[PDB]
Amino acid sequence: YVRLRHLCTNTWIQSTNVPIDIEEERPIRLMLGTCPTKEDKEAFAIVSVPVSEI
Structure with missing residues (x-):
């Protein structure tokens, strides 16, 4: 496991339920x-x- 933090913003990358394919x-x-x-x-x-695969 790993938590991704934007080094340029120090903000967590959260799994948002927003549907991009509206x-x-x-x-x-x-x-x-x-x-x-x-x-x-x-x-x-x-x-x-x-x-x-690669």
């Missing part, structure tokens, strides 16, 4: 918002991609 009937992408607080609830971990 125009689409069934949006698939949810915008990631700026959380001023250090809410560790959002857990953005890193998973190794397959070498063949």
Whole structure:
């Protein structure tokens, strides 16, 4: 797990439920918002991609 903080703003990267694909009937992408607080609830971990995939 890891918490991403914008070094240029010192703001947490929170998982915002804002639907970016408003125009689409069934949006698939949810915008990631700026959380001023250090809410560790959002857990953005890193998973190794397959070498063949790369």
